[PDB]
Amino acid sequence: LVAPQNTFLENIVRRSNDTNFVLGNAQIVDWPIVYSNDGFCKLSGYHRAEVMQKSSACSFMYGELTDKDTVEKVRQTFENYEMNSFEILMYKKNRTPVWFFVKIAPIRNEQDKVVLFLCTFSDITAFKQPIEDDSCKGWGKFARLTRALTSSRGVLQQLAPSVQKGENVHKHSRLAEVLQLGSDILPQYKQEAPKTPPHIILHYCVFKTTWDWIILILTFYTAILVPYNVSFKTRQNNVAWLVVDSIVDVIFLVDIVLNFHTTFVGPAGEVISDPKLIRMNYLKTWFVIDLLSCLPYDVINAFENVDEGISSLFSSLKVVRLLRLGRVARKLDHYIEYGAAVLVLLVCVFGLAAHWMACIWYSIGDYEIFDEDTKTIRNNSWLYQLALDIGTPYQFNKWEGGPSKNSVYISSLYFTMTSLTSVGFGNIAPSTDIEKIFAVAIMMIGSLLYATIFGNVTTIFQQMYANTNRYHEMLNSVRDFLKLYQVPKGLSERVMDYIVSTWSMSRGIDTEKVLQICPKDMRADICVHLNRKVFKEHPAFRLASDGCLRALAMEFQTVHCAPGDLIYHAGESVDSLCFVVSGSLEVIQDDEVVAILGKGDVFGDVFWKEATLAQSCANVRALTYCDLHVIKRDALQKVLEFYTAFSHSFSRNLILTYNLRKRIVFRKISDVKREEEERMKRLPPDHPVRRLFQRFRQQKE
Amino acid sequence: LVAPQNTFLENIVRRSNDTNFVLGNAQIVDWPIVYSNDGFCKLSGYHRAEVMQKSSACSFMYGELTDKDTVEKVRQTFENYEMNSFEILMYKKNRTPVWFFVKIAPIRNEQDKVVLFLCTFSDITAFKQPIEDDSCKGWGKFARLTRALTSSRGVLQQLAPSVQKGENVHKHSRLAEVLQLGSDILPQYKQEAPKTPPHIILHYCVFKTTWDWIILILTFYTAILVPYNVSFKTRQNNVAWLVVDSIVDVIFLVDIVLNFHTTFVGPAGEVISDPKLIRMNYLKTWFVIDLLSCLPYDVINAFENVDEGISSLFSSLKVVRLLRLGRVARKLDHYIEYGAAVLVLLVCVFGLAAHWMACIWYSIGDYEIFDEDTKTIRNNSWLYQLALDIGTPYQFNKWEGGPSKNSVYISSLYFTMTSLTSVGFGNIAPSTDIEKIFAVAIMMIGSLLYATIFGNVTTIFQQMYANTNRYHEMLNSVRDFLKLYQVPKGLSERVMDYIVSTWSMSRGIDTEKVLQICPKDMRADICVHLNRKVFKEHPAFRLASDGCLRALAMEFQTVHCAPGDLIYHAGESVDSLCFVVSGSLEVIQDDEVVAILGKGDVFGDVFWKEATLAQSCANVRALTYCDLHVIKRDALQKVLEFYTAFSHSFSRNLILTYNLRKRIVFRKISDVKREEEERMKRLPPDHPVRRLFQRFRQQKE
After folding, report:
1. B624 touching A, CB under 8 A?
2. CA of B176: how far to CAs of B11, B17, B105, B166, in Å?
3. Distance between CA A480 and CA B395 in Å, rounded?
4. Would you state the CATH architecture of domain B511-659?
5. Mutation test of the interface with chain B: which of A40, A189, A422, choosing the one with the most B Cβ atoms within 10 A?
6. Which residues of B touch A34 (CB under 8 A)?
7. How would you describe this protein's topology in the membrane (chains A, B)?
8. Integer Cα distance of A623 and A611 in angstroms
């Protein structure tokens, strides 16, 4: 976990080595000071807050003895961007003059430009011509001046009292640290990556990734071949296996050496790349184990024809080559997390265990069958029962070969395989004490490993089907509720269809939760992108600043309306401007069509001007699958009143397509025709309606 | 579950035994009264509220007959801290004089000091010289005085009327209870631990813990050896087993005895340590069972050579030694909770059941094989089939020994093992009716136990992988959302990287939930520790009291910002002071660097002075992995206005590094150079811009 980060301050403070620095801007008139340091504030007496936003020429610290020639030099060097180091008397808060040495070194940028200046400071007050302005005593002023040069008097020039005429080297010693700032100028105020130290290969590189698989394949091959070779009485009539063994040893030794020069993930951190402790970590962790596993003890003895005693006993222990599984033990944490890879690992270890146990079974049978000097055939042993069953039984003149190795290995593997899988055909079965003990052990191991496999498979299935079961349960609950509360089909069908359709599109994701997971800036940018369709299109938003745009994108809400669904029923309070972005809607007023809205149109009421709620005067109905972007009145009013400059143009530029509060008046053709027909066929006691007419006239007046 | 608690009040009220006491302070002038009692208030007529904060010399209760000599005695004893008991006439609310006896006994402290006084009270009005001030009648006053001495007239001195001249012992009887207060003075007002009663060993001690494992090992050994010994016709040719059996019996009897003197966890409480019922609990729970299991019935009969009839029948029942599993039945609740220990327990019980069933199988075979007086060999039995298969078949001259016990036991164990593991090689198989019935039983038991093992393994795997599956599901949901809503890669990469990185560091812990779980004081202290980095460092907080410090630590929030993430975009409302504690940030104004912030710097606006919101005038961008401590404006204003004294120094001491509301003005070198170049190359109808200039001048005026 590493990101491209600007390492300006860290590198500069590490490389300063008990010095002081002030950063200045390079592209502004008079070069305002952009940063100061604790050492600078301590030496000058000026606080960082009161020294910020000051000219980098340090004119704020000038006085009587400052030289116009020095002013010219600093100005010309600043305007020329050249490395230089001056010494000029400077003035602190109390105006008391003290000698001073300076050095200026601007730093470039990755885009081939100069952005930041850097002026360093040094004190030579105790090692220059003594100058005083107003002090109680000359020696007192000298002591005061000397008390400020602790950095110079320290280990930087601690050998000065022990020697004489050291001024010829004190300046060089002081400037040596300052000249190192070019090393910290290498990032050049840019997103410099964490470059690795030389002769170290990152462990997430392509080469390392493709090497790990080869090392795993080779360790698998050696784990398979070692017990077979050690137990099945195989001969060395085939030389090429020795050559392949030698190449295997070479590859493993090369990997062992390469494990020194490779970064590793630190348990107490994230990434460690320090060669002074990487090698120590590897050596203390696994180097001894891998080296002892990676040496062919018998190879040298066989090549040199050593004595058949202690040397042969040492050589015969090549079973120790099996512990090469340290590589797999290391690697298994890379892919142990996957649900579906643990099953493959378990199947592979099942097969490997089957091979090992079959090899042990042959070893037991071969140790058992003969009776050594007793010359008894021991017809009890399975290795004789199989020789009788399969054909070519034993005979003597020396004893015959009986079964061949090719069939013997397959038979042993079949027996171990049936024992592990717990099928148990039993045509080959243990018969003596040692075989029976081994049988008890093998049944126990097989039962446990089978339990592990079954557990893993059940976990995979359950974690696969949990989500579908949850969805089905929710649907069943909704159906049961709707059946219980006697809701008719005309609404039940719509509810079930809406639930099914919304699940089909939204899948198992919650937009609110996804938004809340991310931080604030990510939330802002995601919302701005989601409402880009309205923002870029509608002309009323073309004069929006970043802050108001984000504050509006936070509140804008997207609503999907299916055809047939009403949005604003007649008489409902209207409190939300809504921009149509897709599909089309219509407005119905007194069971008639009075306007039709399409893409890029907004309908509602002018909230910031009306400042009151009104009843909706017409119904709005969906026609096609539309997308709406509604915004509540309160949030819009708050944002608009916060951004007065934005409002002064928003009010002028936003014109509503249809205003819901206002309603139109009109007459019907059928109504006027009926009125004319009635008039074609055309009160003294009408006191109540006379009073009604008088009241209506008074109200209209 | 016991904690170090001060048992002052509980012990003193238990030991008072129907008396009264008033606690007084020992390190304050005039010794204000720190606590009173119901008995004291009832007898004196003064309420606790109106008697608190009064001199411990009881001068508030003095009157005419109080003696200056008694005042001198009480003062000198109080200043000398000495045990003493006086009697002096005291005055109640109605001023009526009544005789009184007092005793003062200060109590020390664990730090070798005196902190609390203790003055006891007693009434001797009815047993002293009668004194009256103003009463209706002498006998009436006598009755009134006698009516107040019920505590003395009770069982404390109930034998006084039955005897004469009892005043010589009444004082001793009254003082005996008061003198016991030294026992309650033992805690000395300190965190006294709940010391155990003598001759009782706590059951969570090291000795008990290390003894439990030994008793479990020995019960396992006896459970393994008992059925083998009882069934396999083993002989006593090896004496040492009898000695080991004797030592086993001694150890178990010692454990049985030791179970009397050991505290046990009470089901209806937490810890019970009362010896008068601990022994009863053990006896009613398991003592009879353990004692009957822990006696070698046959040992005494064998040693004494008892008759081979009823005594031998009694002795032959040593199978009853098997019920020693009561210890494991008790103990299994200690380690039943662990998920990974139930598997080991199940494997052990599997092995033990296998051994038991193999022993039963041998018993059945040996009972079956021979036909008793019929002399029939019964070639059907497995114990003859095995003797034919393995070699050395039976022969007669008496009948031959056939197979040896060493092979017979292994064969029986192998048969039971295959039956239980459900492998079923079948080279040894039941052949008669009894064997077939036992086979049906053994298959059923094996199937059920195998089911239990598989269930346990599946539960372990699922509970191991649930968390990883949940994390993967959440990541997949976020990826699916981002794919659905067409967000570009430039934002998708950042979102996915943020989620992965935040999970990597935070693991599966929610800071808000962890905070909410704990109580209020723990929450406050945890928050104070979490913000210690700012609190101890920033000088503006060096004058903070406990209440304001906690009220600020409750609202301070920690924010981790990755490099490249913006915090305050230009034009956004600024409402939060934020202290930088690690890394470094920069402020960008008009695409330029104007200030740089490091460790121990704060940027925002002076809320308590401005009392209004302002638009941010510059962008702030992260450079390195930084930690921010932001605080909202409302909470800070509320706390500051609550703590006026704290505010009067906070405003003076807090100086902002960069003020976002304030914005600096400047010119660019390129801009001024271009302006000069344009000027080097250098209106009557300009009425609109003349009007613009006039309006600008009017606005500036």
Report:
1. yes
2. 17, 11, 14, 15
3. 80
4. Sandwich (2.60)
5. A422
6. 593-596
7. Multi-pass membrane protein
8. 31
